[PDB]
């Protein structure tokens, strides 16, 4: 109200409204689902178009051979944060000959977002990210919020109507975690999960975007007729 003019102002109840408004941009964004087993990690994203003449906005971005994310909210902010991850993943490789741990990647994103929430002049990031990766401690899935909060999860979903997919994964927890050494079945579970967030529209060939990473599987994105198999 009087305490939402900038990010440097707490409300009387200890809330940061600009951060909460940035969080609101994620809820307006298109749905994206993340889930993993012990061997593989999968991203599934519902892409959004402007109209029938327009293309479908890309949702998934590759950060390294072993790591990448999906976005929901302001796409340009995802480009900035993914570019930062690309640089950090790359700094780890060039200096330490070491693949960046997914957990450490989350800590770096948290700290980068935090600086924008405590200083005058700037603004919080208006995007949420689901980071998947496979490192020395196996498969991983992270959820990033522009408040700075990063959370390691078995599965999750963000964006509009994401609660439906999140409930499904909460039921299926014991099943999809055990899908080891079977990428197609893990993707099926992700496609079935994101389907719980759909209304009116359904999953078409240029609508669906899938990504996967695993033990002997580099981070690869599937679009177009490559995802027709899963429709």
């Amino acid at each position: 109200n009087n305490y939402d003019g900038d990010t440097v102002t707490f409300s009387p109840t200890g809330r940061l409204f600009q951060v909460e408004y940035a969080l609101e941009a994620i809820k307006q964004g298109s749905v994206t689902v993340g889930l993993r087993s012990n061997t593989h990690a999968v991203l599934v994203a519902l892409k959004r178009n402007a109209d029938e003449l327009s293309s479908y906005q890309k949702k998934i971005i590759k950060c390294d051979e072993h790591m990448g994310l999906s976005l929901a909210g302001l796409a340009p902010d995802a480009r900035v944060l993914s570019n930062y991850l690309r640089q950090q993943c790359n700094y780890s490789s060039l200096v330490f000959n070491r693949k960046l741990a997914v957990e450490r990647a989350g800590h770096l994103l948290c700290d980068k977002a935090q600086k924008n929430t405590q200083s005058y002049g700037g603004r919080p990031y208006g995007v949420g990210l689901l980071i998947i990766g496979y490192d020395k401690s196996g498969a991983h899935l992270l959820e990033f919020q522009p408040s700075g909060n990063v959370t390691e999860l078995y599965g999750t979903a963000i964006g509009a109507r994401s609660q439906g997919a999140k409930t499904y994964l909460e039921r299926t927890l014991d099943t999809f975690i055990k899908i080891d050494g079977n990428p197609d079945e893990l993707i099926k579970a992700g496609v079935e999960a994101i389907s719980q967030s759909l209304r009116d529209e359904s999953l078409t060939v240029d609508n669906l975007s899938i990504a996967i990473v695993g033990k002997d599987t580099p981070f690869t994105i599937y679009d177009g007729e490559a995802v027709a198999k899963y429709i």
Binding site: D4, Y21, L23, N49, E52, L53, S54, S55, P76, R79
Partner: protein
């Protein structure tokens, strides 16, 4: 007052949303992509008859394989065009090749959100970036001040955009020729323009793989206008 980079309660940047309103006041610009080429056309909209209309430059060359049309606060486009031309030629310097249309568009869109309290406000102009490369062929992009860019088969921006876009919805198909696209841009421009369309107050351009980016002469456009009138009178 209030921050320039402030979020609204709905989760939108106030300034970005306000710049979009400025673009709605701008003159109409239309782009149509085909397999034979991409056509770009604009409404010049001279404020007075004494204004020499040929000096109105709302269609612009970025590279030999990339063209650009603009709508909104057209003065803001000059630094964006300068950056685009620099990015296009710089990539040719570093990699001895033409730059991808998407990559060029992305470079322009990276400037968009570089504002705060960097420039003091977002750009008040939208761009239709049309071009061709070997990888993805003939392409048409719509670059906004939000930093977002959508690829389009056909797109209209400016004051008569939603009316023109609805018309492009029906008319566009994947087997359009270049000549058909030219007449289609002229048809829709004539529909949304206030003043009567002629070769002096409207401009055409195209990008083909062979000849590259070309702005059409007033004599060449005049014939296409005359060809349009006759085919509409034919039924």
């Amino acid at each position: 007052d209030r921050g320039v980079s402030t979020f609204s309660p709905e989760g939108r940047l106030f300034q970005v949303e306000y710049s979009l309103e400025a673009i709605k006041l701008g003159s109409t610009a239309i782009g149509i992509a085909t397999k034979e080429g991409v056509v770009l056309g604009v409404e010049k909209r001279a404020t007075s008859p004494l204004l020499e209309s040929d000096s109105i430059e709302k269609i612009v060359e970025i590279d030999r394989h990339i063209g650009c049309a603009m709508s909104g606060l057209t003065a803001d486009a000059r630094s964006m065009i300068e950056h685009a031309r620099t990015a296009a030629v710089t990539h040719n310097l570093y990699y001895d090749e033409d730059i991808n249309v998407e990559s060029l568009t992305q470079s322009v869109c990276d400037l968009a959100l570089r504002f705060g309290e960097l420039m003091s406000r977002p750009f008040g102009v939208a761009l239709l970036i049309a071009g061709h490369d070997a990888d993805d062929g003939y392409q048409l992009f719509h670059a906004e001040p939000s930093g977002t860019f959508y690829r389009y088969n056909a797109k209209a921006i400016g004051s008569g955009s939603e009316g023109a876009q609805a018309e492009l919805l029906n008319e566009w198909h994947s087997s359009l020729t270049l000549k058909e696209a030219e007449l289609l841009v002229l048809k829709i421009l004539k529909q949304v323009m206030e003043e009567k369309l002629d070769e002096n107050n409207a401009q055409l351009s195209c990008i083909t793989k062979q000849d590259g980016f070309k702005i059409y002469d007033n004599e060449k456009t005049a014939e296409l206008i005359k060809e349009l009138k006759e085919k509409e009178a034919a039924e």
